[PDB]
Design a protein around this motif. Structure first.
Motif, PDB file in Angstrom:
ATOM      1  N   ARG A 174       5.119   0.039   3.090  1.00 30.13           N
ATOM      2  CA  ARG A 174       4.892  -0.839   1.903  1.00 30.13           C
ATOM      3  C   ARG A 174       6.116  -1.230   1.076  1.00 30.13           C
ATOM      4  NH1 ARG A 174       2.713   1.559  -3.886  1.00 30.13           N
ATOM      5  NH2 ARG A 174       0.889   0.225  -4.371  1.00 30.13           N
ATOM      6  N   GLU A 175       6.920  -0.233   0.691  1.00 26.96           N
ATOM      7  CA  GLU A 175       8.061  -0.515  -0.150  1.00 26.96           C
ATOM      8  C   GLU A 175       9.009  -1.314   0.717  1.00 26.96           C
ATOM      9  OE1 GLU A 175       6.699   2.676  -0.887  1.00 26.96           O
ATOM     10  OE2 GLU A 175       6.305   2.237  -3.019  1.00 26.96           O
TER      11      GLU A 175
ATOM     12  N   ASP B  33       0.603  -8.923  -1.992  1.00 27.10           N
ATOM     13  CA  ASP B  33      -0.816  -9.278  -1.770  1.00 27.10           C
ATOM     14  C   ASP B  33      -1.563  -9.125  -3.081  1.00 27.10           C
ATOM     15  OD1 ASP B  33      -0.299  -9.723   0.989  1.00 27.10           O
ATOM     16  OD2 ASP B  33      -1.308  -7.979   1.740  1.00 27.10           O
TER      17      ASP B  33
ATOM     18  N   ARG C 249      10.224  -9.046   1.198  1.00 27.57           N
ATOM     19  CA  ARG C 249       9.766 -10.254   0.450  1.00 27.57           C
ATOM     20  C   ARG C 249      10.703 -10.714  -0.664  1.00 27.57           C
ATOM     21  NH1 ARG C 249       4.025 -11.012   1.124  1.00 27.57           N
ATOM     22  NH2 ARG C 249       4.184 -12.902  -0.149  1.00 27.57           N
TER      23      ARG C 249
ATOM     24  N   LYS D  37       7.963  -3.656   2.797  1.00 28.57           N
ATOM     25  CA  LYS D  37       7.505  -5.056   2.763  1.00 28.57           C
ATOM     26  C   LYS D  37       7.923  -5.722   1.455  1.00 28.57           C
ATOM     27  CE  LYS D  37       3.762  -4.949   6.002  1.00 28.57           C
ATOM     28  NZ  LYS D  37       2.294  -4.715   6.353  1.00 28.57           N
ATOM     29  N   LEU D  38       7.888  -4.952   0.367  1.00 24.66           N
ATOM     30  CA  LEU D  38       8.413  -5.355  -0.919  1.00 24.66           C
ATOM     31  C   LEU D  38       9.880  -5.702  -0.822  1.00 24.66           C
ATOM     32  CD1 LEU D  38       7.862  -5.686  -3.899  1.00 24.66           C
ATOM     33  CD2 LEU D  38       8.569  -3.344  -4.226  1.00 24.66           C
TER      34      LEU D  38
ATOM     35  N   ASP E 145      -1.369  -1.044  -0.098  1.00 27.08           N
ATOM     36  CA  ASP E 145      -0.588  -1.613   1.059  1.00 27.08           C
ATOM     37  C   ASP E 145       0.561  -2.583   0.788  1.00 27.08           C
ATOM     38  OD1 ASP E 145      -1.672  -0.237   3.176  1.00 27.08           O
ATOM     39  OD2 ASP E 145      -3.097  -1.819   3.783  1.00 27.08           O
ATOM     40  N   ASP E 146       0.447  -3.405  -0.261  1.00 31.33           N
ATOM     41  CA  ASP E 146       1.459  -4.424  -0.508  1.00 31.33           C
ATOM     42  C   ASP E 146       1.283  -5.122  -1.880  1.00 31.33           C
ATOM     43  OD1 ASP E 146       2.386  -7.297   1.741  1.00 31.33           O
ATOM     44  OD2 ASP E 146       2.143  -7.283  -0.450  1.00 31.33           O
ATOM     45  N   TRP E 147       2.368  -4.993  -2.612  1.00 31.74           N
ATOM     46  CA  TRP E 147       2.468  -5.410  -3.963  1.00 31.74           C
ATOM     47  C   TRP E 147       2.331  -6.922  -4.068  1.00 31.74           C
ATOM     48  CZ3 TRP E 147       1.864  -2.580  -8.010  1.00 31.74           C
ATOM     49  CH2 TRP E 147       2.243  -1.221  -8.013  1.00 31.74           C
TER      50      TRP E 147
END
Lengths: 374, 383
Positions: free
Chosen positions: A248-249, B230, A255, A251-252, B226-228
């Protein structure tokens, strides 16, 4: 037909006790997981949680009860519902929040067992193409530039292929300039341990001249927007370590474009499957990575070196030879350099045949086991 | 000075089995922290970690060893520091633990027992000490989901008949719009919230958006952790505020939430955040950001419930609490006098200078499955 899970708690004397705030760390406490099937075939792994929760929130004591009273029972229940696929093991542990190092210990032991069971090199099952890995040395700061230079000299003279210099405000450019002056061709990275602030953008940019491999953790943890702005203004890749706990971090990070390099610890990510998933995200974002260390015993060192063989692991690993950590380790033959500053990627079909069982008996302080069918 | 810490591991029978995740369970495990000074003045607190690590990463087992082998020793070391020589300031106690990562529910138990001891030592109401003004707080009821819309409406009526000033409906994909529509039509002016427990995915956004028609106070935890981005995209698409509980474990995560526009309401649980000082810092940041906050529950014993009602007195705590009367949960709790409605749906904010005087020592003792005491000056303890 996995039948038994045995947890071994060990204390190994550190060759070089490490300074802490109020004293010293002289022993590595580690938890080894040993899985045994009906035919006696074994897989082992190491939980990498450290003795005190100073680097992450898990520590040996809490890992122990988390495995004994929560994760092992869950794993047993999942086993009792139908050969076993190591890629699906974390499904047993679906509902568990965090505890990724305890989860990794189970998941990696299952891969290690499955390599042993099938007689295939574990590295090959995971998709690791690299045959050997380069190793970095980490150098602390020094008020004296001559002392810093001597430490670099000694590292280069011991074979090392990368050096990683600790830096901080007022203790950065002078050091890096003097090192790059002396070694125009050496790979140099820097580790800032969160000591910079967004105002320091111009100072960090100044370091673009030295062709550093990366700057690790420039800003405080979770300054995400500040980090994305800082990386946008630097040609040198930012590397993250503790800022990225989970996929998760990551994917942050991707992005926001907040960093371009990752310090991967497979145990912190939750095991081999999680590492593979992280490298997928990273590769799609055009990031690259390297394996960091947690002063592992040889079991964890073997698995870390195998992870370091994965394609996206393009920078030197911090995992050195056993003799930089322990006078006596848990493997029949210590992990050693195969060329100066280079270690051969472990080609074992599971680590079990490499474990010195007398050494594990001697270093053990507690053992606990359970029949996974019960 | 503070001389002894006693940890009590408790197992309390529940009136009926509570919902786990995929199961039910008979008994509530809890850890109480008891501090005693040389004059016999005491502070108590509750570590709110649940028995399984299914809501956060802490559980009873791991919090117990964290307290015994790591946090209590660190706290003893700090107590012996010259700067704690004359006064122990509860405001600064987290500095004893500044090198610990995470473990916020264990950390909070230390910090909150020190606040509690300090109120009792100075004979000042704990709530005034923290700046909590409200004298009373309104209370919500959580209603489980059923595939029977009849059961649901019957549950709602029953809550309403009892005076609860909010209902929070459990929802999931396929069992959301119908329940909420029915409840909203029947109760045009009732505060209704919804709790998704992470059951939605980004592809489900159109369903959640249909919910804006019902004027929910918030939708709690719609997505997995899961994802900030989203989450940010979902909140940007919803007129209804998103509420986060377990997705926000620290003041820095709350900063990021606010920066992303990922949510508009915070479920505050002082233990999950790291204690009273952390809770005040979170409320500062939520207020600066335009967010509303309210206090949620952890099936607390009386000690935790008392402390959680004191936090619910704070100015930004604008919505109803999930912390309801003792008796909804336990035949016998750890207080001499159960926590109860002062009027239907309302609870008086505790004015105790510390909860020690309210603790039923016999109940604490009966429910104890383990007990550990330590001389804070030496560091010798026993079982």
């Amino acid at each position: 037909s996995l039948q038994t899970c045995v947890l071994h708690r060990l204390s190994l004397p550190l060759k070089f006790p490490m300074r802490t705030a109020h004293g010293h760390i002289r022993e590595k406490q580690a938890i080894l997981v040993q899985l045994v099937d009906a035919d006696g075939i074994e897989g082992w792994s190491e939980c990498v949680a450290l003795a005190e929760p100073t680097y992450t929130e898990e520590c040996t004591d809490t890992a122990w009860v988390m495995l004994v009273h929560h994760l092992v029972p869950r794993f047993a229940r999942w086993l009792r519902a139908a050969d076993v696929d190591p890629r699906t093991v974390c499904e047993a542990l679906r509902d568990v929040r965090g505890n990724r190092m305890s989860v990794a210990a189970i998941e990696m032991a299952v891969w290690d067992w499955y390599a042993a069971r099938t007689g295939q090199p574990l590295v090959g099952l995971l998709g690791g193409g690299r045959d050997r890995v380069e190793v970095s040395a980490t150098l602390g700061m020094s008020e004296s530039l001559d002392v810093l230079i001597q430490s670099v000299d000694a590292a280069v003279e011991q074979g090392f292929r990368r050096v990683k210099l600790k830096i901080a405000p007022g203790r950065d450019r002078a050091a890096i300039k003097a090192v790059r002056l002396r070694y125009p061709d050496l790979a140099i990275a820097a580790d800032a341990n969160g000591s910079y602030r967004p105002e320091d953008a111009p100072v960090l940019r100044q370091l673009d001249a030295y062709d550093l491999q990366f700057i690790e953790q420039p800003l405080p943890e979770d300054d995400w927007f500040d980090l994305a702005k800082l990386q946008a203004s630097l040609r040198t890749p930012v590397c993250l370590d503790e800022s990225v706990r989970s996929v998760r971090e990551l994917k942050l990070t991707a992005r926001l474009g907040a960093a371009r390099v990752l310090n991967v610890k497979p145990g912190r990510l939750g095991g081999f499957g999680a590492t593979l998933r992280a490298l997928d995200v990273a590769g799609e974002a055009g990031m690259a990575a390297w394996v960091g260390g947690m002063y592992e015993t040889g079991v964890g060192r073997v698995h870390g070196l195998i992870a370091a063989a994965l394609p996206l692991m393009r920078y030197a690993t911090d995992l050195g030879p056993s003799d930089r950590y322990f006078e006596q380790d848990v493997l029949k033959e210590p992990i050693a350099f195969v060329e100066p500053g280079v270690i051969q990627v472990p080609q074992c079909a599971g680590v079990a045949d490499w474990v010195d069982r007398d050494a594990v008996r001697r270093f053990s302080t507690a053992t606990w086991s359970v029949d996974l069918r019960t």
